[PDB]
Symmetry: C2
Subunit: 162 residues, 2 copies
């Protein structure tokens, strides 16, 4: 149920092996942390989101970012699968490393960049991923995502050694 | 199933009574037509979309628009409900009537406007709606959404008189 979904700390893994981590911190907030790929190293705390239950076993988590990126994710916890679509401004695709930071401390840079560089055409990425780690960390657990990704961290998260 | 979803011609109705119409014309294309509200009169043909089946009974239809608007919809046909999130550039919220047209014949205006006016902060609208009309019109039926909305048209669609 929704009570079970809120608090979920997940890693999901794309076909190419990229690992993305999310924590459903409360009914309107996520933290997230990206371990691989185009924006590996990016992490975000206290992102306001819309979270709804679409039907039994299906949740939707959606938000807009200070960079302009729009995201709509669906999670299907019982099937250990998610789907996401990300609508990136062109500039995020062309200058991804600008976005690779603890975004919360670089909002002004995100805003400068979204005005400086081109938005269109957008780079739109819809893709499924497998949910390859799940633990409920409770609500408003501020320790779950509290520093940048480091080498081997996803192994450490799955091992429960942190 | 997906074969049943593709071809769906729907009207869905928000709590405020606004009626939005969509036609899932093929596995990567929609047409749509808005009868009420902020952008009443807007209609679009041949919009490329991502359509996936998330699980039994749950579909996702998502796309970006020439105006910059990003949309991610979920349909739950058996429960006669949908959820959508729309991420509007600020300018679409402030100048909605620019977008009220047959968009296909005004792409240059959409592109001029998305560059002329402000994008941020976005106006983001997540909302459920009830699916209040459904008929499968087949695949690539070019007559389903082929002119602008007019007074009473949704009654005419539900009556099957067109």
């Amino acid at each position: 149920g929704m009570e079970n979904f809120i608090g979920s700390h997940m890693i999901y893994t794309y076909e190419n092996g990229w690992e993305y981590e999310i924590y459903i911190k409360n009914d309107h907030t996520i933290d997230y942390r990206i371990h691989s790929g185009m924006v590996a190293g990016r992490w975000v705390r206290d992102q306001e989101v819309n979270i709804v239950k679409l039907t039994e076993g299906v949740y939707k988590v959606s938000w807009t970012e200070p960079t302009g990126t729009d995201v709509s994710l669906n999670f299907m916890p019982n099937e250990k699968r998610m789907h996401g679509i990300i609508f990136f401004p062109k500039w995020v695709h062309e200058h991804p490393e600008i976005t690779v930071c603890y975004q919360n401390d670089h909002i002004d840079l995100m805003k400068e960049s979204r005005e400086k560089y081109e938005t269109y055409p957008k780079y739109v990425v819809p893709e499924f991923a497998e949910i390859t780690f799940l633990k409920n960390e409770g609500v408003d657990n501020e320790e779950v995502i509290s520093y940048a990704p480091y080498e081997g961290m996803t192994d450490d998260i799955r091992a429960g050694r942190l």
